[PDB]
């Protein structure tokens, strides 16, 4: 096998992939790794069997740096996973991890601002950010959408966001929504005195239309926009990220259509690779998990991709799914956004798991507070601040979250109607 | 109940909790010091405490992510010293909001920022029970 | 169940989806269809069990036309398959078909030219088109790439194409390749007297760079460019298709990363939906199948999506995988491109299966002809023309393909060295 | 007759026309319908005689959807009524109605904002809008025009408008008028606290000049402009409507030169077809009737075209002149504007006939109030609000309009000087 | 005349530490130094645009600091914003951002950027009413040795 070189030592500039592959019976693992690998040739330098699964191996592939176009996530995905999931010799194939060498990382702009620049621009420190998804999902007029945005933001929420499928429809054209949301953002800012924002959806049919929506957001002076990178495409995302860096706009990234590629354990691309591709292409926030009942998915896997998308240097840790040491050479980090049913008594768990550098999203639209949207937002903000204060005092949140919530509720009438 | 939109201003972190006592401020400063960070004190009167768009009149192209009064005025070993400085700032400027800031000395970035004082004279803010009417 | 309405009659403007879903044990099929469905609410109007698979049902969902943005494939995919493959209540979920109502179809531009306009522009009638993928895949200099293009085109091939991963690399920058390929195209045109072309890869990191490459192709006067729509994104593709319509350029579409979504039978999106999304977004050609050994995949399924991407009116045919009647209301058709190991004696089978409105691609780079690239191209062209002539005479290609090939070889020295 | 097919069933995508034709004596109705009708051929599928008129028939023609250019009212009118009114075989011919299939409707942008978006932007609900035409018609300087605008708006009127023939003249150049009207609008807004507006006439000789005037209105921040679509042309109107949608401007449409085409019962195009063409091309308001003495014209016909230009779904009603069911598939509605001599005691009748979704225009310039322009505007506003309040209470306006007017006058000194 | 300062020398400070500071902290230092009574502050010579502090963030925070110090003291303030860049297009873009913020003055390294880049920046500054501070980086490589090189006076005249 010219393409299986177990004695090869990967270079400091090689792009490395870790494939979890299940070959068809009768096909030796060495032959299957050689096929995936097949001066500019990709080569399989390491194969390890999976302890716990039958006929399952991890194949490590090394690609020369000259193979890829500088600063192009599109080309990287075309080269690595263009036509390899269609090999008949493989029963199942799953890309688990990528190693982006610093030499390649330096060719990317990365996220427009990052976590620290975001915190400095918004003047919010020492706590997680809070967001809500305006509900109902569709049918609402731009005026009523703006009213809901203002009501939720004035309560104490830092962000609101358009629904993932809200781009521009007969019921609510995009420019009307942008104008009414801008009025709501400014009203809530004047009322509370804190900087507010709303994830305006710029996702559109053509790059020209998407840039026009970003331009409108820039002309209104609003802080942040939103994009669907897995449906819009890396090419559209990279254009939007370059624009946002040029014009000082924050960029929230929603991972629509992700489960179509990262759900099945045997086939597809693991979300961590999609998260690294997003960080390379550019995004200040990246919807990274759902909290149905509780944070779903293995905690270690979540922590692994959160560290991969946040930290500057992540050492190899197979326990958390890190197959390679990832040096980001000072590329700005991406803030993970945990969305879903974030109930008030579940805030301590998520604050403990994520820390301060994350945005908790109430994608359920809240509305569970009997008093209204604004008091519900206040209750959430009070709960988050109380949990953060308790954690800063040395409390163990996983053991005293209920006590902290009760103690905060003892003095908060808004949280009292929420804790019931 | 209805969240009051009248005289209900807030100052970011820990602003939605009841006013912190000396022991609570001390514990927060000890947390900042434990992490290896430097605590300092910011203060501003009521005229330059809230965000504003006063200087946006001088700008073209865009004003995205620009807000006035994000910077306050600067006023660092342990909680007791920062508490003493908090009392000193209170005496020197009784009508000024005081904010405790944290700075990571290695990354050279601000890592903390919570209000610790609200001037009794100013009435632009509500109390934990008067926030809803 | 408010979202399962078996008595509902879908409207003439509804977008219809046919989901193949396997619910978790204990979950009734009606409940699972209701969940997928959940004035602007999607509703499950029909559920049929799959005869042959245990706990497998086809769920038919009706979406109101007001839900989607006009002319936006990105929004359509965000709405239909945004977050539905991540439902825990479903063991597996697979989108099988879509029904695009004429009202929605009319909001899309569609392919820039289509099959008939392509034939008229290229002045080629009554036969399939021929193409080759310049090989080696990578490492070749722009000069040598152009030399290979000229050698393959002068033989009689109608098209050549850049490799899918060839965009712009240190070994071969894109503008050098465009210039040398333009010189080769013009030399081959002057030599043979037939209009020639080369699928120039415009796939790039940013929409601006992609439009710049398209602009260079337009300034050279070359006929056709190429795009990777599943990696570049629908937003980038739609921009390129609008540009190509505006400037009179043909657009070849390569389906890189398709097997990551359309390979597994239980999970993902069937290629036919991706083909319909491509036809809506825009593309004159669409790589539609591989011929490893022979045309791979169920013939009926291939014929179904070929008819779906070619014809103007496709009636429901569950045998070929057509779950809904598709009216295209005069949208230009897309030419299917069958690539892979098209050996000379396998030409009659593919000519019979596809007919004249297809492009046969020698993605293996040919080179199997002992004489050279040009005679190998001639042999292929001679074989294709002989098969077409035999089919026009009333011959049964599936039974007399070898006889036709031998008879053509009796007078063709180039085919004689190829038939061995 | 190849073009008369009485057994033909019109398709869901056909454009249908209902022609009222009087053929020359000796010409059978079937032959005349065949001539008007004459894969892409228009066909006469139905002919009904008119009961009440001699030798009068209604001919129903079906045109294939492929015949017309997407989003082009100009092409639609060229195809349907290009050269058919010049047939010698017809003594008289009158186009009565059109059926625009949803498939065609979706290709049009429609009105820039519509009624509901207009109400939300202006923050005016539950009542009709009020407007005045600044008088004298011509000769007034830009300064004096602005003074009149400010005086009329401060009284309580929601809108003022330029005279139909006021575009740009030696006596009053357009930019001076725009500036003075902007100052007047802002002064009246500051004084009353309500959002005000003035229909600035953008109608010009060249599309470039018209877009420049729209651009000036956009740069002043004023809310609304005006256009003469039947004299400027559908091509100019569609450009202006696209611009207004892009830049967030309202668009009032005046039907100058309409009686030249929609006055005679036997020849021409009925206003309802012109109203549907305007709604397709784009317009937020459309001057729809005159109130000389009282609302002129058959009430049912007026109600029919008002419903056709307002509602989303209008069922066939021959009593009101609706020859076909019109589905607008969520296209924004157009607000009808009734102008002319709207006297104070005639307000209850028009409020009952039109409802809240209409603008009553005092095209007489008011001035009948002995006190001044501002008190006259106040009297009108008081009368309209009193009539609306009475209607909301369950009163029958057609029977108690005088009582309501008197009761309002009992407490309104301004209305007391107006009611005399 | 533009700065309304007469009869005295002008005062400036170089924000320190040289590198590593975030745009927010750089702006805080600028505001603290300017509010004291200094007429100018300046970016470090090697501070153009780095992973630790991108140039547009620094421009925005410095603009906020300049305006805060102006409002507090009532005197016109300024900060030498470094426009020195890799390409003339990028340098003109940074000058354009400074012009759009309304800030008074920018900075350039003429001996490293080049006379061609400097002349373009000076023409732009004349066109748009911006002051231009010039730093002589790499000067000692040419004007230090008494026997070889070009004396600084010739570089000053150039």
Author numbering:
A (entry chain A), C (entry chain H), D (entry chain B): 22 to 59, 79 to 460
B (entry chain P): 2 to 76, 83 to 140
E (entry chain F): 160 to 317
Manuscript text:
To determine where CsLinker binds CsRubisco, we elucidated the 3D structure of the α3–α4–CsRubisco complex using cryogenic electron microscopy (cryo-EM). We prepared samples of α3–α4 and CsRubisco such that the solution concentration of CsLinker repeats was comparable to the value we measured in the chloroplast (32 μM in this experiment, 37.4 μM in vivo). This concentration also saturated the α3–α4–CsRubisco complex. During processing, we observed a low-resolution density in addition to the core subunits at the equatorial region of CsRubisco in the RbcL. We hypothesized that this additional density corresponded to the helical regions of α3–α4 and that substoichiometric binding meant many binding sites were unoccupied, giving rise to poorly resolved density where the linker binds.
